[PDB]
């Protein structure tokens, strides 16, 4: 019976952690895109100066 209750709570926890880490990955990718845009535009205006 302890095995069955562990199976239920494990399945719920793993679905939660999967959804959380998926959206965290998407938002970290968007932060990466904004960061590299910042770096290349400041580098370009430095080179032109």
């Amino acid at each position: 019976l302890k095995a069955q209750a562990l199976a239920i709570e494990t399945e719920a926890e793993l679905q939660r952690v999967q959804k959380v880490r998926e959206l965290e990955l998407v938002y970290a990718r968007a932060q990466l895109e904004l960061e590299v845009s910042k770096a290349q535009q400041l580098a370009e205006v430095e080179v032109k100066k």
Binding site: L1, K2, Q4, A5, L6, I8, E9
Partner: protein, 50 residues
């Protein structure tokens, strides 16, 4: 005293049987009550988990 010991042997056999019955009944009753409480708690824990 020899005749008294001849009958006292059978008295001690019957007392051995009675002590066996009493001891195994007490232990069986307590253990089965604990197992029943544990089974109800386990099924309740399954439902709580869901």
């Amino acid at each position: 005293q020899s005749e008294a010991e001849k009958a006292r042997k059978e008295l001690l056999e019957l007392e051995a049987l009675s002590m066996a019955v009493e001891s195994t009944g007490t232990a069986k009753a307590e253990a089965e009550s604990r197992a029943e409480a544990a089974r109800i708690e386990g099924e309740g824990s399954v439902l709580q988990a869901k």
